[PDB]
Design a protein around this ligand. Structure first.
Ligand SMILES: CCCCCCCCCCCCCCCCCC(=O)OC[C@H](CO[C@@H]1O[C@H](CO[C@H]2O[C@H](CO)[C@H](O)[C@H](O)[C@H]2O)[C@H](O)[C@H](O)[C@H]1O)OC(=O)CCCCCCCCCCCCCCCCC
Ligand SMILES: CCCCCCCCCCCCCCCCCC(=O)OC[C@H](CO[C@@H]1O[C@H](CO[C@H]2O[C@H](CO)[C@H](O)[C@H](O)[C@H]2O)[C@H](O)[C@H](O)[C@H]1O)OC(=O)CCCCCCCCCCCCCCCCC
Ligand code: CLA
Ligand code: CLA
Ligand code: CLA
Ligand code: CLA
Ligand code: CLA
Ligand code: HEC
Ligand SMILES: CC1=C(/C=C/C(C)=C/C=C/C(C)=C/C=C/C=C(C)/C=C/C=C(C)/C=C/C2=C(C)CCCC2(C)C)C(C)(C)CCC1
Ligand SMILES: CC1=C(/C=C/C(C)=C/C=C/C(C)=C/C=C/C=C(C)/C=C/C=C(C)/C=C/C2=C(C)CCCC2(C)C)C(C)(C)CCC1
Ligand SMILES: CC1=C(/C=C/C(C)=C/C=C/C(C)=C/C=C/C=C(C)/C=C/C=C(C)/C=C/C2=C(C)CCCC2(C)C)C(C)(C)CCC1
Ligand SMILES: CCCCCCCS[C@@H]1O[C@H](CO)[C@@H](O)[C@H](O)[C@H]1O
Ligand SMILES: [Cl-]
Lengths: 451, 334, 81, 137, 342, 34
């Protein structure tokens, strides 16, 4: 039992996985077995979703989070996002589930059967956390893999059927992307946009040409950086800035994952391009704008002049100006005037919502789309009673956008806590006082008094 | 000894009466900016159109407020989540009308307080301490982020962020109950357990250590003079404390290891407040408390009310009255 | 220690489990039957799903007198046909 | 109180013929109403147009009358405005518009009767709560 | 003299797994009956005849919505003894009339007395100062003021809190709508004591855990402590320098620190109790007269205080008919206060 | 060596005996239909 108790290892059972820090062979097993769990869930959950899926109900009425991801890539859907073929969902699930047994197998072997340390067995697979050259080489391999992964999305988009495009003329459809945006001013201009309202940083990406072109740039950058880090070793300024240890490296990744979880939380809450509302339900801004649209349409049909209807506050009951003059929906949804969506943009003119188009060009499919989104607003209780907190039981609904945003905020928050925990500990362990203050060497006793 | 190294050694010096440090280099200007603006706005700012309907709310003392009713009022609903620094306004008078100060205060404060947390880590490193005091402070810090930043983001407007005032806080809480039924959310319930339990264990630990102080003084003097700052020996008898409290409940419900006792004192309120902060942060995306409205039905189908339905009646009264002029359409979807 | 037998000793002894593999399920089944026979309703005076209201009434049988409260409840119970 | 056959007896048509539903029909009507209709009609109101509710008194004064099984089944095939003057299949779910309202594709004639029966029975149970909105919650 | 009294004293004070004591004769039956009454009532007993509510697992409620509800308002402040003139010895009627509520509240009150006597009794036997009992006066002050004094000032036990999760939430919301209790400075002080106590709990626990002396070689620092050691297990000197430089001030006296941790939450609970005594008489902090005079005359004057009263007005009108069924409130739709659209 | 019937024995069973009976009662309730 090498390092398998508290006396030999110094770590109690509740920190038991810390006993693996310098046992690269068992550590490899732990990571591979764990990836099997990830792949297992992906395969099993997809099959569960498919078994429970009724093609005549919108996905977002059915508690689906994985099938919407598959459908967005262009598999199984046609015009308007209608499901034409559920077999791709079946394949994706089966293949992930079968692969998890391979990964589970290798994970269990390395964890309990294979060599505990890899350094004696292979200098290629062996590593020392302090070997800055080896660590950047391992990092370089994984950047190349990630870069290839980004290019697979480009290949799907350009050569293997395309992607679902919520903005496609005619109500949304799978479309092959023939001219991805390559202009670096566009691609990197997204990175310098303010993250506040009306700008939205990278969350504002609103067309597939930018999405595909960005992944071309990311693929190349990752492949180049992966080669760079195979061939180089950290420079002197870098060497002096960091802590070089297993726990330190873990803490940096925890910081990175936390940041990414917060970004994903906002992506799914605001973006309706790579999270099409056909599959995920309307965004919060979207459903709120759709209510104003619904009642503008109802009241205009009854003979109201909605352009000149003064509401109780003095602002337009249906229409008003944004702080920069654009014509926008009134009521409390004035806050959401930055919303853009395929069902709304035909009413937009250079000055914002166009009154002539409102009076003359509203099509029945827009009325349908706005009434559907208004009644699937992402509001609901923890037991999945749809609607405002004061609604009665009847509708079993919570938007996928709420499930995905809340879950990833919670996860991103705890990963930020994990970063602080492990970064603070890595610093203390490197300097040598993570177990407490040396009584005979207490630093404060050598310092001058404050007063 | 060049000038940059001198400056670096002063910044990180453990001899300054107040530690500066690299986090303090961001902390000090941002906290000063937020404090100065807050004090001036609280005393003298004119009314603010919080809900974007040209209906300004008076928050400052000079405009008819006392300490209890006063606030710095959140920025206009017409602005939503847009960035509104002073230089985006046509004049200071415009900026004040639209609640510019609220944005300046909370952004500087959230930066400053995040750096306050880094500064706690930083000084512990300079003194040879263990690093995790800043992890405990992350619980109140996360709570501040929840009511000033995360909740506005999910609802689409800083006008639904918490006001900077006493009665403004109450307004925020009441409307939150109406729109999310937070009392019925298990994360707020875990938060109540966090702070009720934290107050319980605070009085517990304080009373047990106080109960077992070793006699070192006469009755005419404060027992506090029986402890001397820096003394090597413990000042109370933890065995007698454990012997009392073990008999109060039973032996194995009591701590005799001071280290794990104090770890428990840290963990219980910090974990509970994390859950409270996560409650606010997930109700920001409208995943609301349990809804049992009309959950109990008789044989014919009559609704049988429960206490949940009585709560709903109260929430309805809050819902229909809040922001009484701000809604033109039947559903308050944000 | 206070002299009683350690709990860990007791609950890993075969004799403990010989006794409690009977006494635990027996209590559970008694609780089940207390409900399934309907006896719980009658002991505590709790309405069945069909006895909250009369067939056409929608008013609560609320108690409104202090010292005739017992008779008021009995009168409400008669009126269930 | 109990779900009795009296409760489950509703008008079949305008001429005064009644029909008595089974408990299974009523419960099936509730489930299907939740499936296809409650997103806008929860509780008997109409979220996208609150002027029109599903109270029997409101259905009686529609044109043609909708306070009976045949009127309600016809409405789910070919809905009209309240005065009968216009056909609104293009914006209201119906069998005629099952291509654009896909949840209507798997409703059968027997389902329409069960949904209709639920709409006519619920007010007899809930009184003012049906179509009354939040005031009666 | 070794008579029967002294022999009984011997047996009561034996060092056993569960200490008993003289206090145990009061404590154990009353605690057990209060808890058993709450479990019995939330499992089996209705609130149909007193409140018009289902309130038991038997009726379909869950852990959040079960309660032992208060008696009907028409019982007044009756003790509701099982053998009293209302239930007249009828156990089923007693349950239907709310007898379990006074049963739980009264056995609970005497149980709490017994627990505090237990703290005194064990402290005297072990030889410690009785500060744990003194601190326990604060939960007692809360229980007595909220569950006894408050309804005794009101019309009946009906308006006391009912014993359940969601029932207590209704009690919070009633106190906002009717009493404007968030505005009350005695509540504010209680909030300060509870939140300040939670703060002190977290900060002291974390400070100790991050100024520990290295008294062992393991990465788990819990093992490096012995209950009988004479040395402090953490550095008061280093902790004092840390907080002085982070926060400006720090504790330097460990005895003061721990008395303060007793003082803060105990004082806060006591202040909140005083305010609830006022609410027994409706002696509220409801309004600021200066605000009302201005706002009555100046329809452009609006504050967060006036915004909150409109919320209170909504709470009262929309919840009163269901929450006070004995009053028979009929509020037609047209009298209900509402904003635009909602 | 050890006794069987002690004060601790009584305290354990005054709690444990009703608990099991109640768990069975509440389990039965999950199959009640209106
Ligand atoms: C190393 C660290 C260094 C730190 C650097 C500090 C620099 C500033 C930090 C960022 C501050 C962000 C504040 C504003 C966040 C926000 O408004 O976020 C919103 C934005 C998205 O912006 C929205 O983006 C939208 C884009 O959608 C548009 O485009 C879409 C296209 O499909 C749709 O059409 C849609 O309808 C249309 O409107 C619109 O522009 C909206 O108006 C706009 O608000 O999120 C985003 O930019 C991306 C998400 C940002 C992360 C969110 C912050 C969370 C912080 C949690 C911290 C917890 C700490 C706990 C302490 C313990
Ligand atoms: C500290 C640590 C303590 C540890 C815990 C101790 C727990 C001990 C348990 C004791 C419980 C006491 C129960 C008191 C019941 C009660 O009061 O019951 C109330 C009765 C009076 O009954 C009430 O009387 C009212 C007034 O009626 C009178 O007026 C009516 C209207 O005009 C009619 O004329 C009527 O005929 C006439 O009687 C109404 O009728 C009410 O419905 C009826 O309930 O008083 C009485 O029994 C006796 C009243 C006199 C003694 C009161 C002292 C004790 C209570 C102090 C609390 C102060 C509260 C004031 C608010 C602050
Ligand atoms: C993803 C979660 C995960 C993974 C992959 C690991 C992995 C590991 N842990 Mg860790 N651990 C975890 C969570 C995890 N742990 C949790 C939650 C705790 C708290 C309880 C711990 C506490 C802990 C302690 C205290 C210790 C470890 C140790 C270990 C290592 C050796 C385990 C061993 O020797 O068991 C031997 C056990 C068996 C032989 C019994 C069965 C084990 C197999 C693998 C079950 C697999 C079943 C599966 C269905 C089979 C699929 C086969 C199919 C694919 C063909 C191993 C790499 C040890 C270590 O570090 O050694 C140096 C160690 O001392 N862990
Ligand atoms: C990729 C992420 C990652 C990895 C590889 C590690 C790895 C490690 N952590 Mg770190 N940690 C992380 C993220 C991570 N952590 C995060 C996000 C947090 C914030 C919560 C922490 C907070 C943390 C603390 C406070 C400590 C560690 C410690 C450790 C070391 C021992 C871990 C162990 O054996 O736990 C054993 C696992 C358990 C005891 C099981 C925990 C059970 C969890 C709480 C259940 C969660 C509930 C679940 C999500 C849902 C409910 C399930 C239920 C219904 C069945 C090991 C190096 C220890 C250390 O410092 O060693 C150096 C240590 O003291 N971690
Ligand atoms: C990314 C994470 C994620 C998200 C967003 C969803 C979302 C959803 N799931 Mg999926 N699922 C997940 C992971 C996720 N799931 C995992 C890990 C499993 C395997 C257990 C499943 C297995 C699963 C099944 C079998 C089903 C769903 C269903 C659903 C839908 C309804 C959810 C519901 O009612 O929850 C109820 C809410 C809860 C149970 C709340 C959990 C509270 C946790 C325990 C708190 C944890 C906090 C934190 C992690 C711990 C910190 C500890 C601290 C000390 C550090 C919803 C779309 C349902 C569906 O509709 O399918 C179509 C359904 O039947 N999911
Ligand atoms: C990233 C995960 C990973 C890593 C770094 C290793 C590394 C190692 N393995 Mg382990 N192992 C793994 C996963 C991994 N394995 C998996 C998934 C399984 C189940 C198939 C195993 C089962 C296994 C056994 C039975 C043995 C090892 C052995 C070894 C050692 C020698 C391997 C060698 O020289 O092959 C040379 C390289 C090749 C033969 C090339 C393989 C190319 C693969 C099969 C094709 C796919 C490549 C492509 C990138 C895959 C993408 C997958 C992705 C989509 C998930 C080395 C330390 C040996 C050992 O421990 O000696 C004592 C040994 O006997 N492994
Ligand atoms: C997982 C991805 C990854 C990781 C972990 C690393 C890690 C490393 N890189 Mg490598 N690198 C990568 C990918 C990665 N790289 C890729 C894809 C490329 C190709 C573009 C490179 C090209 C590269 C070069 C040319 C160099 C490195 C170097 C390094 C080392 C120093 C890093 C450092 O100081 O950052 C700290 C970050 C900075 C100092 C940036 C400036 C600080 C700004 C102000 C922070 C702004 C933060 C703000 C919140 C940004 C938000 C988003 C923003 C875009 C708006 C470190 C080992 C250095 C090295 O030593 O090489 C041997 C080095 O010279 N990398
Ligand atoms: C929102 C997208 C709706 C869905 C889903 C359903 N209904 Fe509906 N209904 C809706 C509106 C906007 C209206 C008014 C139409 C008009 O302009 O007149 C209606 C009306 C009805 C009526 C008539 C009610 C009356 O005349 O008093 C009935 C009987 C009705 N709707 C029934 C109904 C059924 C059975 C549904 C599920 C199959 C259904 N509706 C769904 C909006 C929406
Ligand atoms: C190390 C360790 C650990 C861990 C472990 C793990 C984590 C493992 C994993 C594992 C895994 C990860 C596994 C997996 C497996 C899998 C499988 C075995 C699968 C199979 C499949 C199948 C058989 C399928 C089938 C089918 C088809 C094909 C079709 C459809 C239908 C069905 C589904 C039927 C623990 C913590 C315990 C502790 C100790 C140590
Ligand atoms: C895909 C895509 C795209 C693109 C993208 C991109 C292009 C990205 C990039 C990105 C990037 C490019 C990023 C970056 C990042 C960075 C970071 C995040 C950094 C950090 C840093 C740090 C953390 C540092 C720290 C420090 C300091 C500061 C001092 C000294 C010490 C240390 C080092 C610690 C778009 C949008 C178009 C569209 C969609 C899709
Ligand atoms: C009132 C009265 C009385 C009494 C009675 C009694 C005394 C009773 C008791 C009773 C009891 C004594 C009961 C109990 C019950 C119990 C239960 C019912 C429990 C349950 C539990 C559970 C359900 C759990 C859960 C959980 C938690 C909580 C956490 C952890 C995990 C778990 C999940 C497990 C007399 C006769 C004198 C007289 C008349 C009146
Ligand atoms: C009430 C309790 C009062 C104690 S009473 C006391 O009890 C003694 C037993 O020690 C007897 O010997 C003595 O005669 C008797 O008066
Ligand atoms: Cl509105």
């Amino acid at each position: 039992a090498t390092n398998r108790d508290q006396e030999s290892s110094g770590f109690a059972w509740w920190a038991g996985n810390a006993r693996l820090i310098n046992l690269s062979g068992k550590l490899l097993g732990a990571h591979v077995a764990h990836a099997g769990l990830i792949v297992f869930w992906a395969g099993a959950m997809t099959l569960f979703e498919l078994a429970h899926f009724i093609p005549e109900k919108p996905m977002y009425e059915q508690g689906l989070i994985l099938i919407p991801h598959i459908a967005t890539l262009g598999w199984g859907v046609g015009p308007g996002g209608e499901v034409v073929d559920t077999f791709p969902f079946f394949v994706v699930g089966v293949v992930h589930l079968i692969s998890s047994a391979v990964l589970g197998f290798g994970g269990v072997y390395h964890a309990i059967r294979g060599p505990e340390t890899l350094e004696e067995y292979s200098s290629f697979f062996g590593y020392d956390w302090k070997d800055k050259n080896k660590m950047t080489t391992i990092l370089g391999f994984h950047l190349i893999v990630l870069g290839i992964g980004a290019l697979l999305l480009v290949a799907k988009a350009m050569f293997f059927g395309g992607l679902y495009d919520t903005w496609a003329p005619g109500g949304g459809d799978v479309r092959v992307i023939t001219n991805p945006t390559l202009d670096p001013r566009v691609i990197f201009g997204y990175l310098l946009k303010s993250p506040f309202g009306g700008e939205g940083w990278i969350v504002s990406v609103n067309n597939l040409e930018d999405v595909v072109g960005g992944h071309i740039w990311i693929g190349l950058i990752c492949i180049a950086g992966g080669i760079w880090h195979i061939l180089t070793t950290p420079f002197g300024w870098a060497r002096r800035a960091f802590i070089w240890s297993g726990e330190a490296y873990l803490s940096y990744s925890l910081g990175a994952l936390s940041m990414m979880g917060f970004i994903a939380t906002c992506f799914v809450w605001f973006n309706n391009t790579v999270y099409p509302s056909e599959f995920y339900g309307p965004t919060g801004p979207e459903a709120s704008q759709a209510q104003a649209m619904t009642f503008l349409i109802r009241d205009q049909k009854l003979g109201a002049n909605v352009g000149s209807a003064q509401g109780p506050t003095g602002l337009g009951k249906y229409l008003m100006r944004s702080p920069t003059g654009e014509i926008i929906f009134g009521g409390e949804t004035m806050r959401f005037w930055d919303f853009r969506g395929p069902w709304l943009e035909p009413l937009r003119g250079p000055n914002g919502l166009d009154l002539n188009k409102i009076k003359n060009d509203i099509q029945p499919w827009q009325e349908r789309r706005a009434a559907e989104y208004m009644t699937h607003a992402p509001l609901g209780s923890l037991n999945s009673v749809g609607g405002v907190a004061t609604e009665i039981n009847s509708v079993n609904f919570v938007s996928p956008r709420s499930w995905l945003a809340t879950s990833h905020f919670v996860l991103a928050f705890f990963f930020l806590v994990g970063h602080l925990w492990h970064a603070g500990r890595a610093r203390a362990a490197a300097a040598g006082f993570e177990k407490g203050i040396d009584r005979e060497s207490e630093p404060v006793l050598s310092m001058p008094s404050l007063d | 000894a060049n000038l940059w190294e001198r400056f670096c050694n002063w910044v990180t010096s453990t001899d300054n009466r107040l530690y500066v440090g690299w986090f303090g280099v961001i902390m000090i200007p941002t906290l000063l900016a937020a404090t100065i603006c807050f004090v001036i706005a609280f005393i003298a700012a004119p009314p603010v159109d919080i809900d974007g309907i040209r209906e300004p709310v008076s928050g400052s003392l000079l405009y008819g407020n006392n300490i209890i009713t006063g606030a710095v009022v959140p920025s206009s609903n017409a602005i939503g989540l847009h960035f509104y620094p002073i230089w985006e306004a046509a004049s200071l008078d415009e900026w004040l009308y639209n609640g510019g100060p609220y944005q300046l205060i909370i952004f500087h404060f959230l930066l400053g307080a995040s750096c306050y947390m880094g500064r706690q880590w930083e000084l512990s490193y300079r003194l040879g301490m263990r690093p995790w005091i800043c992890v405990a402070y992350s619980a109140p810090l996360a709570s501040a982020f929840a009511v000033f930043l995360i909740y506005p983001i999910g609802q689409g407007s800083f006008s639904d962020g918490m006001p900077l005032g006493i009665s403004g806080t109450f307004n925020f809480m009441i409307v939150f109950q109406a729109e999310h039924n937070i009392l019925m959310h298990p994360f707020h319930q875990l938060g109540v357990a966090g702070v009720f339990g934290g107050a319980l264990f605070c009085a517990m630990h304080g009373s047990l250590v106080t109960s077992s102080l070793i006699r070192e003084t006469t009755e005419t003097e404060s027992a506090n003079y029986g402890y001397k700052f820096g003394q090597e020996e413990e000042t109370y008898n933890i065995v007698a404390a454990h012997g009392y409290f073990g008999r109060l409940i039973f032996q194995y419900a009591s701590f005799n290891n001071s280290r794990s006792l104090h770890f428990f004192l840290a963990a219980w309120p910090v974990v509970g407040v994390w859950f409270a902060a996560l409650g606010i942060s997930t109700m920001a995306f409208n995943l609301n408390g349990f809804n049992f409205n009309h959950s109990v039905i008789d044989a014919k189908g009559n609704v049988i009310n429960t206490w949940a339905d009585i709560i709903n009646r109260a929430n309805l009264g809050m819902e229909v009255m809040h922001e009484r002029n701000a809604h033109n359409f039947p559903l308050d979807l944000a | 220690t206070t002299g009683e037998r350690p709990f860990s000793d007791i609950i890993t002894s075969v004799r403990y489990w010989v006794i409690h593999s009977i006494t635990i399920p027996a209590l559970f089944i008694a609780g089940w039957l207390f409900v399934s026979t309907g006896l719980a309703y009658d002991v505590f005076g709790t309405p069945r799903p069909d006895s909250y209201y009369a067939q056409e009434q929608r008013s609560i049988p609320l108690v409104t007198d202090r010292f005739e409260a017992k008779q008021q409840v009995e009168t409400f119970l008669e009126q269930l046909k | 109180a109990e779900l009795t056959p009296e409760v489950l007896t509703v008008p079949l048509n305008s001429e005064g013929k009644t029909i008595t539903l089974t408990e299974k029909q009523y419960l099936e009507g509730k489930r299907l109403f939740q499936y296809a209709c409650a997103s806008c009609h929860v509780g008997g109101i109409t979220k996208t147009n609150p002027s029109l509710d599903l109270r029997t008194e409101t259905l009686a004064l529609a044109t043609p009358p909708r306070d009976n099984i045949e009127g309600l089944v016809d409405y789910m095939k070919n809905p009209t405005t309240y005065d009968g003057e216009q056909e609104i299949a293009e914006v209201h779910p119906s069998l005629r518009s099952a291509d654009i309202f896909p949840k209507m594709r798997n409703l059968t004639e027997k389902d329409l009767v069960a949904i209709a029966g639920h709409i006519l029975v619920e007010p007899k149970i809930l009184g003012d709560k049906w179509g009354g909105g939040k005031v009666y919650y | 003299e070794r008579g029967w009294f002294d022999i009984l004293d011997d047996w009561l004070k034996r060092d056993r797994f569960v200490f008993v004591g003289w206090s145990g004769i009061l404590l154990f039956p009353c605690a057990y009956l209060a808890l058993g009454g709450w479990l019995t009532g939330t499992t089996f007993v209705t609130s149909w005849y007193t409140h018009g509510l289902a309130s038991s697992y038997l009726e379909g409620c869950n852990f959040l919505t079960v309660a032992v509800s208060t008696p009907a308002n028409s019982m007044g402040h009756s003790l509701l003894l099982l053998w009293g003139p209302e239930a007249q010895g009828d156990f089923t009627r007693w349950c239907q009339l709310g007898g379990l509520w006074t049963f739980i509240a009264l056995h609970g009150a005497f149980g709490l007395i017994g627990f505090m006597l237990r703290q005194f009794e064990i402290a005297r036997l072990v030889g410690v100062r009785p500060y744990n009992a003194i601190a326990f006066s604060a939960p007692i002050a809360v229980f007595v003021s909220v569950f006894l004094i408050y309804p005794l000032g009101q019309s009946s036990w009906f308006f006391a809190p009912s014993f359940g999760v969601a029932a207590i939430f209704r009690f919070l919301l009633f106190f906002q709508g009717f009493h404007n209790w968030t505005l009350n400075p005695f509540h504010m002080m209680g909030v300060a004591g509870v939140l300040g106590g939670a703060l002190l709990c977290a900060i002291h626990g974390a400070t100790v855990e991050n100024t520990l002396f290295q008294d062992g070689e393991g990465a788990s620092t819990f093992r490096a402590f012995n209950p009988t050691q004479a040395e402090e297990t953490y550095s008061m000197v280093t902790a004092n320098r840390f907080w002085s430089q982070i926060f400006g001030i720090a504790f330097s006296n460990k005895r003061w620190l721990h008395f303060f941790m007793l003082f803060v939450p105990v004082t806060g609970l006591w202040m909140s109790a005083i305010g609830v005594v006022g609410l027994a008489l409706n002696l509220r902090s409801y309004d600021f007269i200066s605000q009302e005079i201005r706002a009555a005359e100046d329809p452009e004057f609006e504050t967060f205080y006036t915004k909150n009263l409109l919320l209170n007005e909504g709470i009262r009108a929309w919840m009163a008919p269901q929450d006070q069924p004995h009053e028979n409130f009929v509020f037609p739709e047209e009298v209900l206060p509402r904003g635009n659209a909602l | 060596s050890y006794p069987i019937f002690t004060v601790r024995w009584v305290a354990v069973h005054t709690l444990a005996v009703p608990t099991i009976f109640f768990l069975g009662a509440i389990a039965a309730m999950q199959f009640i239909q209106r």
